[PDB]
């Protein structure tokens, strides 16, 4: 048995003065997650490009918790549909960063991708990155994953650029609101909203204000 | 460069002066044919350097100009740097080659409009409000020529002044221009009348465009 005491007001409320219905409760999903003792505790994906975006390097930093062992490996593989496009495997142990060494509990993987399909609101090209924590001889401990969009966002010479091109933001602010369920969101409503937005020539959304 | 007394009077009565080298090659095709030619650098240089040597002590002179309507040539860049080197006390401006070249401290277009773009190839005239905020642009904008006052004209003048007052980096301009270039001719009874291009048998000519 779980018991949860939820308070409508807290010191947190002082930072939650959004112009909206003030409600309370367990308003998003509750779940139980089983991880092994030796686990992926964090991972960051980055994509870097050459000047014309015909080459990319996917960089994945992976952190673990549990006992460190020489037999441990991380494999990051990148998939376009059912086709594996690139893969990298390494033992744990990051490069030296200061006088006391580096992160023994981290590893960075770097995958080359030639002519990457670029992500944008116009063409949402995605790759699947699978992060496998495993032993040297291939026993899977656990795998995490995410959708990867190859894109560069930068500000150069006063312009916001996506993939080297200046954006024109056709945006809207969107609160999480249902007239029947309050601030509880569901997939059907989310999808309804996205379809209506794109059908009316919006390409961007601001998570007002959370 | 003007008659020397002009500067003395502007010193004493109080007017800001843009002193301008006697260089205009408007009729060349393209406009910078001579000004990009190193063979014409000596001749151009004397028109700039000798102006500075003559007029540099006048308080009324606040801006040097490399001339008018001669496109943008490498000779302009060289003479721009010459002035910057011998006289750091005064900005240098020059309109040719699109009003915002590397030979000018001030964006100085002629007849750029307040709100309307005129996107001519190579030498566009942007809305002055838009021009200021083009990516990387930081300079002040002062029109070297605007509000062409030919005959019944100066429509839309207030639109320029509303903009000059609202935008800090829009710091005004010079109207084109002060006085009609009409000349006196006489009828058979000795009565004077105002004449313009073509009235002296001069041909080809551009008629009333001098007024
Ligand atoms: Mg508010
Ligand atoms: Na102003
Ligand atoms: Na004229």
Tab-separated table of C-alpha atoms and ligand atoms in Angstrom:
chain	number	residue	atom	x	y	z
A	1	UNK	CA	0.000	0.000	0.000
A	2	UNK	CA	1.158	3.491	-1.009
A	3	UNK	CA	0.012	6.571	0.865
A	4	UNK	CA	0.482	10.036	-0.676
A	5	UNK	CA	-0.405	13.210	1.165
A	6	UNK	CA	-0.744	16.017	-1.406
A	7	UNK	CA	-0.799	19.637	-0.233
A	8	UNK	CA	-2.594	22.205	-2.402
A	9	UNK	CA	-0.297	24.986	-1.183
A	10	UNK	CA	3.446	25.035	-0.454
A	11	UNK	CA	6.443	27.372	-0.656
A	12	UNK	CA	6.543	25.990	-4.229
A	13	UNK	CA	3.302	27.868	-4.953
A	14	UNK	CA	5.199	31.171	-4.790
A	15	UNK	CA	6.965	30.083	-7.982
A	16	UNK	CA	3.763	28.751	-9.569
A	17	UNK	CA	1.739	31.903	-10.205
A	18	UNK	CA	0.884	31.185	-13.880
A	19	UNK	CA	-2.248	32.856	-15.287
A	20	UNK	CA	-4.416	29.742	-15.215
A	21	UNK	CA	-6.757	27.619	-13.114
A	22	UNK	CA	-5.130	26.824	-9.796
A	23	UNK	CA	-5.706	23.130	-9.147
A	24	UNK	CA	-4.020	20.289	-7.244
A	25	UNK	CA	-3.527	16.535	-7.087
A	26	UNK	CA	-1.694	13.656	-8.688
A	27	UNK	CA	-2.463	14.938	-12.176
A	28	UNK	CA	0.130	13.040	-14.267
A	29	UNK	CA	1.102	9.354	-14.593
A	30	UNK	CA	2.322	7.243	-11.683
A	31	UNK	CA	4.604	4.300	-12.460
A	32	UNK	CA	6.993	1.640	-11.137
A	33	UNK	CA	10.368	1.216	-12.811
A	34	UNK	CA	12.654	-1.780	-12.377
A	35	UNK	CA	16.362	-1.169	-13.083
A	36	UNK	CA	19.259	-3.571	-12.408
A	37	UNK	CA	21.838	-2.683	-9.711
A	38	UNK	CA	24.365	-2.042	-12.465
A	39	UNK	CA	22.393	0.456	-14.539
A	40	UNK	CA	22.470	3.252	-17.103
A	41	UNK	CA	21.814	6.224	-14.803
A	42	UNK	CA	22.026	8.975	-17.441
A	43	UNK	CA	22.828	9.522	-21.116
A	44	UNK	CA	23.190	12.640	-23.308
A	45	UNK	CA	22.957	12.698	-27.096
A	46	UNK	CA	24.584	15.430	-29.171
A	47	UNK	CA	24.852	15.884	-32.952
A	48	UNK	CA	27.617	17.994	-34.525
A	49	UNK	CA	27.985	18.894	-38.199
A	50	UNK	CA	30.363	20.088	-40.904
A	51	UNK	CA	29.648	23.388	-42.725
A	52	UNK	CA	27.279	21.929	-45.338
A	53	UNK	CA	25.663	19.273	-43.081
A	54	UNK	CA	26.817	16.406	-45.351
A	55	UNK	CA	28.681	14.870	-42.384
A	56	UNK	CA	27.736	14.419	-38.722
A	57	UNK	CA	29.172	13.080	-35.490
A	58	UNK	CA	26.722	11.704	-32.946
A	59	UNK	CA	28.244	11.987	-29.481
A	60	UNK	CA	26.639	9.973	-26.639
A	61	UNK	CA	27.805	10.374	-23.057
A	62	UNK	CA	26.622	7.492	-20.869
A	63	UNK	CA	26.745	7.273	-17.081
A	64	UNK	CA	26.379	4.202	-14.898
A	65	UNK	CA	25.664	3.366	-11.277
A	66	UNK	CA	26.731	0.122	-9.613
A	67	UNK	CA	30.105	-1.571	-9.182
A	68	UNK	CA	32.705	-0.710	-11.816
A	69	UNK	CA	34.144	-3.683	-13.726
A	70	UNK	CA	36.588	-4.114	-16.634
A	71	UNK	CA	34.142	-6.433	-18.475
A	72	UNK	CA	31.505	-3.680	-18.725
A	73	UNK	CA	30.779	-2.068	-22.092
A	74	UNK	CA	28.326	0.397	-23.589
A	75	UNK	CA	27.192	0.078	-27.185
A	76	UNK	CA	25.352	2.927	-28.809
A	77	UNK	CA	23.790	1.902	-32.108
A	78	UNK	CA	21.915	4.193	-34.478
A	79	UNK	CA	19.017	2.985	-36.612
A	80	UNK	CA	17.094	4.319	-39.605
A	81	UNK	CA	14.062	2.031	-39.573
A	82	UNK	CA	15.313	-1.552	-39.536
A	83	UNK	CA	18.694	-0.532	-40.985
A	84	UNK	CA	21.580	-0.021	-38.539
A	85	UNK	CA	23.544	2.979	-39.824
A	86	UNK	CA	26.373	3.172	-37.245
A	87	UNK	CA	27.560	1.639	-33.968
A	88	UNK	CA	30.172	2.234	-31.274
A	89	UNK	CA	31.350	0.132	-28.313
A	90	UNK	CA	33.635	1.108	-25.431
A	91	UNK	CA	34.537	0.165	-21.874
A	92	UNK	CA	33.841	2.666	-19.086
A	93	UNK	CA	36.409	5.323	-18.258
A	94	UNK	CA	36.243	8.852	-19.630
A	95	UNK	CA	39.295	10.929	-20.550
A	96	UNK	CA	41.274	12.813	-17.909
A	97	UNK	CA	39.563	16.110	-16.984
A	98	UNK	CA	41.594	17.457	-14.030
A	99	UNK	CA	44.443	16.747	-11.567
A	100	UNK	CA	42.447	13.899	-9.942
A	101	UNK	CA	41.687	12.015	-13.195
A	102	UNK	CA	38.423	11.494	-15.077
A	103	UNK	CA	35.026	9.875	-14.694
A	104	UNK	CA	35.551	6.142	-14.237
A	105	UNK	CA	31.746	5.731	-14.213
A	106	UNK	CA	31.219	7.392	-17.630
A	107	UNK	CA	32.013	6.752	-21.291
A	108	UNK	CA	31.551	8.842	-24.453
A	109	UNK	CA	30.734	7.137	-27.765
A	110	UNK	CA	31.227	8.885	-31.124
A	111	UNK	CA	29.507	7.684	-34.282
A	112	UNK	CA	30.152	9.035	-37.774
A	113	UNK	CA	27.072	9.565	-39.928
A	114	UNK	CA	27.491	10.464	-43.618
A	115	UNK	CA	24.727	12.469	-45.339
A	116	UNK	CA	22.446	12.444	-42.278
A	117	UNK	CA	18.737	12.984	-42.851
A	118	UNK	CA	18.097	16.259	-41.032
A	119	UNK	CA	15.292	16.896	-38.568
A	120	UNK	CA	13.055	19.950	-38.910
A	121	UNK	CA	9.370	20.855	-38.452
A	122	UNK	CA	9.089	20.606	-42.256
A	123	UNK	CA	10.526	17.058	-42.424
A	124	UNK	CA	10.759	15.409	-38.994
A	125	UNK	CA	13.482	12.862	-39.879
A	126	UNK	CA	14.324	10.709	-36.861
A	127	UNK	CA	16.859	8.010	-36.092
A	128	UNK	CA	16.606	5.567	-33.192
A	129	UNK	CA	19.547	5.450	-30.768
A	130	UNK	CA	19.786	2.332	-28.606
A	131	UNK	CA	22.093	2.460	-25.594
A	132	UNK	CA	23.073	-1.051	-24.517
A	133	UNK	CA	24.795	-1.705	-21.198
A	134	UNK	CA	26.439	-5.123	-21.439
A	135	UNK	CA	29.414	-7.402	-20.759
A	136	UNK	CA	32.414	-7.742	-23.072
A	137	UNK	CA	31.082	-11.013	-24.532
A	138	UNK	CA	27.563	-9.713	-25.166
A	139	UNK	CA	25.284	-10.408	-22.231
A	140	UNK	CA	22.733	-7.584	-22.143
A	141	UNK	CA	22.307	-5.981	-18.736
A	142	UNK	CA	19.852	-3.306	-19.900
A	143	UNK	CA	19.041	-1.043	-22.846
A	144	UNK	CA	17.629	2.460	-22.959
A	145	UNK	CA	16.774	4.363	-26.130
A	146	UNK	CA	15.541	7.653	-27.615
A	147	UNK	CA	14.481	9.218	-30.899
A	148	UNK	CA	17.345	11.227	-32.443
A	149	UNK	CA	16.871	14.239	-34.710
A	150	UNK	CA	19.968	15.447	-36.520
A	151	UNK	CA	19.773	19.234	-36.323
A	152	UNK	CA	21.870	22.223	-35.336
A	153	UNK	CA	20.369	25.242	-33.615
A	154	UNK	CA	22.613	28.304	-33.463
A	155	UNK	CA	22.524	32.078	-33.414
A	156	UNK	CA	24.904	33.657	-35.900
A	157	UNK	CA	25.153	37.324	-36.855
A	158	UNK	CA	21.863	38.126	-35.115
A	159	UNK	CA	19.849	35.315	-36.757
A	160	UNK	CA	18.476	32.100	-35.244
A	161	UNK	CA	19.410	29.277	-37.581
A	162	UNK	CA	18.243	25.710	-37.824
A	163	UNK	CA	20.536	23.597	-39.988
A	164	UNK	CA	22.144	26.829	-41.261
A	165	UNK	CA	18.854	28.454	-42.360
A	166	UNK	CA	17.027	31.333	-40.637
A	167	UNK	CA	13.799	30.231	-38.965
A	168	UNK	CA	10.476	31.985	-39.274
A	169	UNK	CA	8.606	30.940	-36.143
A	170	UNK	CA	4.878	30.376	-36.705
A	171	UNK	CA	4.245	29.699	-33.054
A	172	UNK	CA	1.564	29.425	-30.412
A	173	UNK	CA	1.575	29.241	-26.609
A	174	UNK	CA	-0.166	26.116	-25.323
A	175	UNK	CA	-1.292	25.392	-21.769
A	176	UNK	CA	-2.180	21.867	-20.677
A	177	UNK	CA	-5.932	22.150	-20.395
A	178	UNK	CA	-8.954	19.922	-20.856
A	179	UNK	CA	-12.479	21.288	-20.129
A	180	UNK	CA	-13.510	18.000	-18.458
A	181	UNK	CA	-10.244	16.734	-16.924
A	182	UNK	CA	-8.611	20.053	-15.998
A	183	UNK	CA	-4.840	19.885	-16.272
A	184	UNK	CA	-4.683	16.142	-16.925
A	185	UNK	CA	-3.349	15.459	-20.428
A	186	UNK	CA	-4.074	12.466	-22.645
A	187	UNK	CA	-2.589	11.250	-25.949
A	188	UNK	CA	-5.826	11.825	-27.883
A	189	UNK	CA	-5.957	15.517	-26.880
A	190	UNK	CA	-2.237	16.051	-27.494
A	191	UNK	CA	-2.532	14.507	-30.975
A	192	UNK	CA	-5.719	16.479	-31.724
A	193	UNK	CA	-3.839	19.696	-30.791
A	194	UNK	CA	-0.759	18.911	-32.919
A	195	UNK	CA	-2.841	18.010	-35.979
A	196	UNK	CA	-4.880	21.216	-35.692
A	197	UNK	CA	-1.723	23.279	-35.229
A	198	UNK	CA	0.043	21.858	-38.289
A	199	UNK	CA	-3.154	22.009	-40.341
A	200	UNK	CA	-3.255	25.744	-39.554
A	201	UNK	CA	0.358	26.400	-40.511
A	202	UNK	CA	1.966	26.478	-37.067
A	203	UNK	CA	5.487	25.051	-36.819
A	204	UNK	CA	6.274	25.865	-33.179
A	205	UNK	CA	4.884	25.687	-29.660
A	206	UNK	CA	5.848	27.336	-26.366
A	207	UNK	CA	5.300	25.255	-23.207
A	208	UNK	CA	3.639	28.122	-21.326
A	209	UNK	CA	4.786	28.102	-18.571
A	210	UNK	CA	6.186	24.790	-17.315
B	1	UNK	CA	34.970	71.362	-52.493
B	2	UNK	CA	33.320	74.763	-52.227
B	3	UNK	CA	34.583	78.328	-52.485
B	4	UNK	CA	36.777	78.842	-49.363
B	5	UNK	CA	34.536	81.561	-47.902
B	6	UNK	CA	31.677	79.053	-47.589
B	7	UNK	CA	33.457	77.211	-44.766
B	8	UNK	CA	34.300	80.456	-42.966
B	9	UNK	CA	30.626	81.450	-43.002
B	10	UNK	CA	29.520	77.967	-41.834
B	11	UNK	CA	32.109	78.187	-39.007
B	12	UNK	CA	30.690	81.568	-37.969
B	13	UNK	CA	26.930	81.182	-38.532
B	14	UNK	CA	26.835	77.545	-37.378
B	15	UNK	CA	26.102	74.800	-39.914
B	16	UNK	CA	27.472	71.255	-40.037
B	17	UNK	CA	29.264	70.577	-43.317
B	18	UNK	CA	29.951	67.455	-45.328
B	19	UNK	CA	32.985	68.401	-47.422
B	20	UNK	CA	33.102	66.297	-50.576
B	21	UNK	CA	35.884	65.475	-53.040
B	22	UNK	CA	35.384	66.536	-56.629
B	23	UNK	CA	34.896	62.966	-57.900
B	24	UNK	CA	31.886	61.821	-59.910
B	25	UNK	CA	32.036	59.235	-62.699
B	26	UNK	CA	28.289	58.606	-62.979
B	27	UNK	CA	28.334	58.122	-66.757
B	28	UNK	CA	30.808	55.210	-66.777
B	29	UNK	CA	29.590	51.649	-67.448
B	30	UNK	CA	29.686	50.147	-64.927
B	31	UNK	CA	29.895	53.135	-62.546
B	32	UNK	CA	33.178	52.012	-60.914
B	33	UNK	CA	35.046	51.415	-64.170
B	34	UNK	CA	37.539	54.199	-63.362
B	35	UNK	CA	37.409	54.053	-59.547
B	36	UNK	CA	38.423	50.362	-59.484
B	37	UNK	CA	41.270	51.076	-61.917
B	38	UNK	CA	44.670	51.670	-60.270
B	39	UNK	CA	45.612	53.904	-63.222
B	40	UNK	CA	43.060	56.475	-61.960
B	41	UNK	CA	44.144	56.271	-58.298
B	42	UNK	CA	46.683	59.141	-58.594
B	43	UNK	CA	44.083	61.523	-60.097
B	44	UNK	CA	41.441	60.489	-57.543
B	45	UNK	CA	43.897	60.717	-54.660
B	46	UNK	CA	44.703	64.382	-55.385
B	47	UNK	CA	41.006	65.285	-55.295
B	48	UNK	CA	40.725	63.740	-51.821
B	49	UNK	CA	44.106	64.625	-50.277
B	50	UNK	CA	44.185	68.254	-51.437
B	51	UNK	CA	40.656	68.824	-50.048
B	52	UNK	CA	41.736	67.548	-46.613
B	53	UNK	CA	44.931	69.636	-46.658
B	54	UNK	CA	42.887	72.772	-47.434
B	55	UNK	CA	39.839	72.359	-45.177
B	56	UNK	CA	40.926	70.244	-42.183
B	57	UNK	CA	41.067	73.203	-39.754
B	58	UNK	CA	37.418	74.243	-40.273
B	59	UNK	CA	35.167	73.368	-37.304
B	60	UNK	CA	32.086	73.409	-39.591
B	61	UNK	CA	33.443	70.435	-41.566
B	62	UNK	CA	32.355	67.408	-39.537
B	63	UNK	CA	32.306	64.649	-42.193
B	64	UNK	CA	34.549	63.928	-45.180
B	65	UNK	CA	33.027	62.462	-48.335
B	66	UNK	CA	34.907	60.539	-51.045
B	67	UNK	CA	32.737	62.008	-53.819
B	68	UNK	CA	29.477	61.031	-55.477
B	69	UNK	CA	28.115	58.319	-57.756
B	70	UNK	CA	31.329	56.626	-58.799
B	71	UNK	CA	30.314	53.088	-57.820
B	72	UNK	CA	32.632	51.405	-55.355
B	73	UNK	CA	36.197	50.741	-56.469
B	74	UNK	CA	39.371	49.670	-54.694
B	75	UNK	CA	40.551	53.291	-55.062
B	76	UNK	CA	37.748	54.354	-52.681
B	77	UNK	CA	38.930	51.891	-49.999
B	78	UNK	CA	42.504	53.164	-50.285
B	79	UNK	CA	41.462	56.814	-49.985
B	80	UNK	CA	39.028	56.021	-47.170
B	81	UNK	CA	41.939	54.594	-45.166
B	82	UNK	CA	44.206	57.526	-46.096
B	83	UNK	CA	41.745	60.011	-44.526
B	84	UNK	CA	41.191	57.813	-41.429
B	85	UNK	CA	44.950	57.747	-40.984
B	86	UNK	CA	45.733	61.491	-41.405
B	87	UNK	CA	42.534	62.838	-39.754
B	88	UNK	CA	40.898	60.654	-37.073
B	89	UNK	CA	38.749	63.644	-35.974
B	90	UNK	CA	36.064	63.224	-38.660
B	91	UNK	CA	34.014	60.261	-39.933
B	92	UNK	CA	34.331	59.383	-43.604
B	93	UNK	CA	31.234	58.636	-45.706
B	94	UNK	CA	30.599	57.544	-49.301
B	95	UNK	CA	27.346	56.408	-50.989
B	96	UNK	CA	28.540	54.651	-54.157
B	97	UNK	CA	28.238	50.878	-54.534
B	98	UNK	CA	25.181	50.486	-52.295
B	99	UNK	CA	25.590	53.067	-49.499
B	100	UNK	CA	26.907	50.592	-46.904
B	101	UNK	CA	30.309	49.492	-48.340
B	102	UNK	CA	33.637	49.197	-46.472
B	103	UNK	CA	34.478	52.750	-47.627
B	104	UNK	CA	31.859	54.405	-45.374
B	105	UNK	CA	31.464	55.012	-41.592
B	106	UNK	CA	27.814	56.022	-42.095
B	107	UNK	CA	25.086	54.205	-44.017
B	108	UNK	CA	24.300	57.031	-46.412
B	109	UNK	CA	21.760	56.017	-49.062
B	110	UNK	CA	20.148	58.329	-51.567
B	111	UNK	CA	16.349	58.187	-51.889
B	112	UNK	CA	15.911	55.136	-49.689
B	113	UNK	CA	12.279	55.165	-48.554
B	114	UNK	CA	10.933	55.054	-45.005
B	115	UNK	CA	8.986	51.779	-45.108
B	116	UNK	CA	9.214	50.595	-48.710
B	117	UNK	CA	12.110	48.416	-49.936
B	118	UNK	CA	13.516	48.932	-53.429
B	119	UNK	CA	15.452	45.678	-53.997
B	120	UNK	CA	17.583	46.628	-57.019
B	121	UNK	CA	20.202	43.951	-57.905
B	122	UNK	CA	23.642	44.544	-56.291
B	123	UNK	CA	22.730	48.034	-55.011
B	124	UNK	CA	19.351	47.699	-53.232
B	125	UNK	CA	17.789	50.639	-51.362
B	126	UNK	CA	16.226	49.116	-48.252
B	127	UNK	CA	13.593	50.803	-46.163
B	128	UNK	CA	15.787	52.914	-43.855
B	129	UNK	CA	14.203	51.305	-40.781
B	130	UNK	CA	14.987	47.841	-42.136
B	131	UNK	CA	18.518	48.816	-43.212
B	132	UNK	CA	19.639	49.611	-39.658
B	133	UNK	CA	18.912	46.111	-38.411
B	134	UNK	CA	20.277	43.987	-41.253
B	135	UNK	CA	22.365	41.127	-39.808
B	136	UNK	CA	25.738	42.503	-38.634
B	137	UNK	CA	24.890	46.158	-39.304
B	138	UNK	CA	25.805	48.588	-36.506
B	139	UNK	CA	26.395	51.971	-38.201
B	140	UNK	CA	24.222	55.126	-38.059
B	141	UNK	CA	22.117	55.934	-41.114
B	142	UNK	CA	22.016	59.433	-42.551
B	143	UNK	CA	20.658	59.916	-46.048
B	144	UNK	CA	23.155	61.801	-48.201
B	145	UNK	CA	20.133	62.612	-50.429
B	146	UNK	CA	16.365	62.298	-49.859
B	147	UNK	CA	13.034	64.055	-50.627
B	148	UNK	CA	13.812	65.085	-54.193
B	149	UNK	CA	12.268	68.561	-54.317
B	150	UNK	CA	11.688	68.754	-58.074
B	151	UNK	CA	8.821	71.122	-58.805
B	152	UNK	CA	5.658	70.358	-56.901
B	153	UNK	CA	7.225	67.889	-54.540
B	154	UNK	CA	8.180	66.892	-50.977
B	155	UNK	CA	5.138	64.663	-50.565
B	156	UNK	CA	5.750	62.276	-47.685
B	157	UNK	CA	8.316	64.498	-45.990
B	158	UNK	CA	6.669	64.083	-42.569
B	159	UNK	CA	7.094	60.313	-42.859
B	160	UNK	CA	10.901	60.753	-42.866
B	161	UNK	CA	10.813	63.016	-39.815
B	162	UNK	CA	8.497	60.773	-37.838
B	163	UNK	CA	11.022	57.956	-38.470
B	164	UNK	CA	14.100	60.088	-37.709
B	165	UNK	CA	12.601	60.990	-34.323
B	166	UNK	CA	11.530	57.429	-33.377
B	167	UNK	CA	14.729	55.549	-34.330
B	168	UNK	CA	17.955	56.575	-32.505
B	169	UNK	CA	20.236	55.340	-35.348
B	170	UNK	CA	18.216	57.215	-38.000
B	171	UNK	CA	20.012	60.523	-37.629
B	172	UNK	CA	18.463	62.399	-40.544
B	173	UNK	CA	19.548	63.373	-44.027
B	174	UNK	CA	20.253	66.024	-46.647
B	175	UNK	CA	17.362	67.119	-48.854
B	176	UNK	CA	18.020	67.213	-52.596
B	177	UNK	CA	18.371	70.072	-53.000
B	178	UNK	CA	18.654	73.739	-52.060
B	179	UNK	CA	18.335	75.868	-55.220
B	180	UNK	CA	16.930	75.308	-58.753
B	181	UNK	CA	19.715	75.269	-61.370
B	182	UNK	CA	17.789	77.477	-63.788
B	183	UNK	CA	19.616	80.102	-65.867
B	184	UNK	CA	18.433	83.513	-67.086
B	185	UNK	CA	17.651	84.103	-70.763
B	186	UNK	CA	16.114	87.219	-72.319
B	187	UNK	CA	13.182	87.661	-74.715
B	188	UNK	CA	13.153	90.144	-77.645
B	189	UNK	CA	12.120	92.972	-75.284
B	190	UNK	CA	14.930	92.252	-72.814
B	191	UNK	CA	12.618	90.587	-70.261
B	192	UNK	CA	14.293	87.788	-68.259
B	193	UNK	CA	12.949	84.231	-68.098
B	194	UNK	CA	14.111	81.080	-66.330
B	195	UNK	CA	15.731	78.568	-68.659
B	196	UNK	CA	16.733	74.927	-68.237
B	197	UNK	CA	18.346	72.073	-70.193
B	198	UNK	CA	17.958	72.433	-73.947
B	199	UNK	CA	17.237	76.186	-73.920
B	200	UNK	CA	20.775	77.089	-75.033
B	201	UNK	CA	20.847	74.818	-78.089
B	202	UNK	CA	22.668	72.328	-75.834
B	203	UNK	CA	22.061	68.784	-77.069
B	204	UNK	CA	21.652	66.111	-75.919
B	205	UNK	CA	20.204	67.434	-72.659
B	206	UNK	CA	18.054	66.430	-69.680
B	207	UNK	CA	15.588	69.352	-69.777
B	208	UNK	CA	14.077	70.436	-66.425
B	209	UNK	CA	15.950	67.834	-64.327
B	210	UNK	CA	18.463	70.542	-63.226
B	211	UNK	CA	15.692	72.185	-61.204
C	1	LIG	MG1	1.282	35.821	-15.359
C	2	LIG	NA1	17.022	59.381	-34.642
C	3	LIG	NA1	18.970	66.963	-60.956
